[PDB]
Design an enzyme around this catalytic site. Structure first.
Site, short mmCIF file in Angstrom:
data_model
loop_
_atom_site.label_atom_id
_atom_site.label_comp_id
_atom_site.label_asym_id
_atom_site.label_seq_id
_atom_site.Cartn_x
_atom_site.Cartn_y
_atom_site.Cartn_z
N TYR A 1 0.82 -1.21 0.00
CA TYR A 1 0.00 0.00 0.00
C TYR A 1 0.85 1.26 0.00
O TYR A 1 0.33 2.34 -0.29
CB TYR A 1 -0.98 0.02 1.18
CG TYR A 1 -1.96 -1.14 1.24
CD1 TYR A 1 -2.18 -1.98 0.15
CD2 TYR A 1 -2.64 -1.41 2.41
CE1 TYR A 1 -3.04 -3.05 0.24
CE2 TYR A 1 -3.54 -2.47 2.50
CZ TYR A 1 -3.71 -3.30 1.42
OH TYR A 1 -4.58 -4.37 1.53
N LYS B 1 0.88 -7.56 5.81
CA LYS B 1 0.85 -8.61 4.81
C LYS B 1 2.16 -8.64 4.04
O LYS B 1 2.71 -7.59 3.67
CB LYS B 1 -0.33 -8.42 3.83
CG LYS B 1 -1.63 -7.99 4.49
CD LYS B 1 -2.82 -7.97 3.53
CE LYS B 1 -4.04 -7.29 4.15
NZ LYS B 1 -3.90 -5.80 4.15
#
Ligand SMILES: NC(=O)c1ccc[n+]([C@@H]2O[C@H](COP(=O)([O-])OP(=O)(O)OC[C@H]3O[C@@H](n4cnc5c(N)ncnc54)[C@H](OP(=O)(O)O)[C@@H]3O)[C@@H](O)[C@H]2O)c1
Ligand SMILES: C[S-](O)c1cccc(CNC(=O)c2ccc(F)cc2OCC(=O)O)c1
Length: 316
Positions: A49, A78
């Protein structure tokens, strides 16, 4: 209802968290600060992200201000697809920890079952536009995740976007040391996921629903796509309960024993989205919302449809 769900590692996970995909770096620090101020205790993050540093600024400031103690927060990140190699997992986790200003994660997920060639590019392409895979088998990636638990970097490990056969492959791994605690998957009234949710819950794996509002800010949105927030049938259920459509869309997964992670950078919406512990959808409401399934996916990982581990060919 209860604010937390018990994981199979013995820890409790808040059922409502704040999503951060697409949250602009210049807005996400304030979004996370506001979220913590208004009661959020779970933040969903990822290296891909590109905003974990800014998320971390907010977490650290609220810890320094003693608004919240670290043990009260549940921070998830993640492992990106270009780090599935055994020798890259620890460093990828450590980079996320450094960016988030943390000395452990509460949960670390394999972001997708598909491993990609390592390098600077998050989506390495061949000259024809196809994603370049890694040969590292997901069972070997899982073993590397287990090491992170044993080194104290993460309290729990899990998976994301795994289909039921891929979950089963982990559960059947020879020498499996830690079962996945969570499978984070797309889930909303247009992609209700009955089969995969039942499978995971039957194995004691908690399911987190992502894109619960249908990801209206997804970069590949087309005008003709369905829109949950504008669906008059869902608006009608919201009106009957004197709640917003978003609040219905967040409460829906909660009542299926799922965790849910709506994203917002808008302070008023961040607060609104948390005000979902004071009303109940009826069984009829729940079945009605389930009836809207169209098998429609926000996140189809389209550049990867020939990867050996692409998850969405299987029915579930
Ligand atoms: N594991 C994975 O592969 C994966 C994939 C996708 C998502 N996720 C996670 O799940 C999170 C949530 O999914 P998502 O970001 O795709 O989308 P989402 O949460 O379904 O929708 C976010 C969008 O809804 C808007 N919104 C939020 N609250 C609203 C409200 N009360 N009223 C009206 N609009 C509202 C947001 O606008 P503003 O922000 O402008 O307020 C934003 O445009 C992600 O951020 C990420 O953390 C994980
Ligand atoms: C189907 S295939 O397998 C695939 C693979 C991989 C991936 C996919 C989808 N995604 C994307 O694109 C993306 C990118 C970037 C970011 F930042 C974000 C995002 O999204 C969200 C999450 O989380 O992911 C698919």
């Amino acid at each position: 209802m209860a604010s937390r769900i018990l994981l199979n590692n013995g820890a409790k996970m808040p059922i409502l968290g704040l999503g951060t995909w697409k949250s602009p770096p210049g807005q996400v620090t304030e979004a996370v600060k506001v979220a913590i101020d208004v009661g959020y205790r779970h933040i969903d993050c990822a290296h891909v992200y590109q905003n974990e540093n800014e998320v971390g600024v907010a977490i650290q400031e609220k810890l320094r201000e003693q608004v919240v103690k670290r043990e009260e927060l549940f921070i998830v990140s993640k492992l990106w697809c270009t780090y599935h190699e055994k020798g890259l997992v620890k460093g990828a986790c450590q980079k996320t920890l450094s960016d988030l200003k943390l000395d452990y994660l509460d949960l670390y997920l394999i972001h997708w079952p598909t491993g990609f060639k390592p390098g600077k590019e998050f989506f390495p392409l061949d000259e024809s536009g196809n994603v370049v895979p890694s040969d590292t088998n997901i069972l070997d990636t899982w073993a590397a995740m287990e090491e992170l638990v044993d080194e104290g970097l993460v309290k729990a490990i899990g998976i994301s976007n795994f289909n039921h056969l891929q979950v089963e492959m982990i559960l059947n791994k020879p020498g499996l040391k830690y079962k996945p605690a969570v499978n984070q998957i797309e889930c909303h009234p247009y992609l209700t996921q009955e089969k995969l949710i039942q499978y995971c819950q039957s194995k004691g794996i908690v399911v987190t629903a992502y894109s619960p509002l249908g990801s209206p800010d997804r970069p590949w949105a087309k005008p003709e796509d369905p829109s949950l927030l504008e669906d008059p049938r869902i608006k009608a259920i919201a009106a009957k309960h004197n709640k917003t459509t978003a609040q219905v869309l967040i409460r829906f997964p909660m009542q299926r024993n799922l965790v849910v992670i709506p994203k917002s950078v808008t302070p008023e919406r961040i607060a609104e989205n948390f005000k979902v512990f004071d009303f109940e959808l009826s069984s009829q409401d729940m079945t009605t919302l389930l009836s809207y399934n169209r098998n429609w996916r926000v996140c189809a990982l389209l550049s990867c449809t020939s990867h050996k581990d692409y998850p969405f060919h299987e029915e579930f």
